[PDB]
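A common beginner's mistake is to predict each chain separately and then try to dock the pieces by hand. The better habit, illustrated here, is to supply every component at once so that their relative placement is modeled jointly.
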Amino acid sequence: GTFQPGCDQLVKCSHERSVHLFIDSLLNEENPSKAYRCNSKEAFEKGLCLSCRKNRCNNMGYEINKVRAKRSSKMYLKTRSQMPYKVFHYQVKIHFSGTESNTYTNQAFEISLYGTVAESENIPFTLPEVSTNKTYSFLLYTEVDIGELLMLKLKWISDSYFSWSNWWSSPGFDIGKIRVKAGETQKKVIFCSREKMSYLQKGKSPVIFVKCH
Amino acid sequence: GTFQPGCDQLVKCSHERSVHLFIDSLLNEENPSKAYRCNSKEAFEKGLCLSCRKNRCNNMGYEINKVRAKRSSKMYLKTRSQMPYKVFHYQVKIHFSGTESNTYTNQAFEISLYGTVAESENIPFTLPEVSTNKTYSFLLYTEVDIGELLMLKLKWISDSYFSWSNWWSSPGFDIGKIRVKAGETQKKVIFCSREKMSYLQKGKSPVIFVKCH
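With all components supplied together, the output reads:
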């Protein structure tokens, strides 16, 4: 609710989204845009609140379900800057493990999504305060339909560009599992790798995870 | 003594080397070509017999030292196919160590030599029956003067060329030390690495060793 990602016509840009999000909900009858109930803006970015039970996860716009409540009801979603205003929502939980206890910060990752219908290749995200023997979670979104997930790359890129940077042996970790919980279709898949290539290292080849169970 | 690496003029090629190795010994007064005493042709290739004490390691040609013996005296050296017929001789002992007990065979290595005067970059050699917790030795020669050794790369190349070959995580080892014994100047240096990049892996970046003591 702070602003909208499209900002005299440019002056009133993010005041007409409350009409262009309703015209889209009137046009797209068969495809609703779900909105998710959370408790604060900062908690929704961590993705701890993608729960669609007990009068949560209502729709947005004309196709909303008549559900009364007892208090104020803050609900959240993300959008896109063009005329189809629907994005999907994915939760990714990552288990870090290793031996060398070394904390870092502001590391940039790149992830892919490989599914039945189509694929998403180069979604960027960052995580501060990475360390061993932890369990981190975040929120991830996209605009291409997937279906059901099959595989998932994971690449930890390098900020340095110099020809020096191939040496001074890079930090690395030992990733075991990734828990993925989809937004709309409440499926909780488990991803893992084989007993080879299970060592993510910065500026190296990415790991490749498959459907584990 | 089987043949010489240069083979009607081409018919009598390796029968005139016994004159062209003597004319070179007459011309190069200041630079003698040492020959090394061993016990068999197969043992000299392993480099177990570069020992220059107790009436061993005589010269070759006109500048030979008058030393009598009790029995037959087989002596060995290597040469080059051109008019300077002198090559140097280096012994390299490599300690393999690791965890995964997996034997291999016919693996090709590439090594470099970095010294005070000049450098030698891409000397090839092979070793059959590589495995963990062993100590292997061989013989190495070159035709460029070095002086005293400073650093030494070690690269284990990949036979495969396909774009497939980046996966199926490659075998690797944990190399601790390399003992190097020079031929003429009897110096026994010790090489090691830092506590990083000490993991030689096939088709990856090579390790770099320095003067350790």
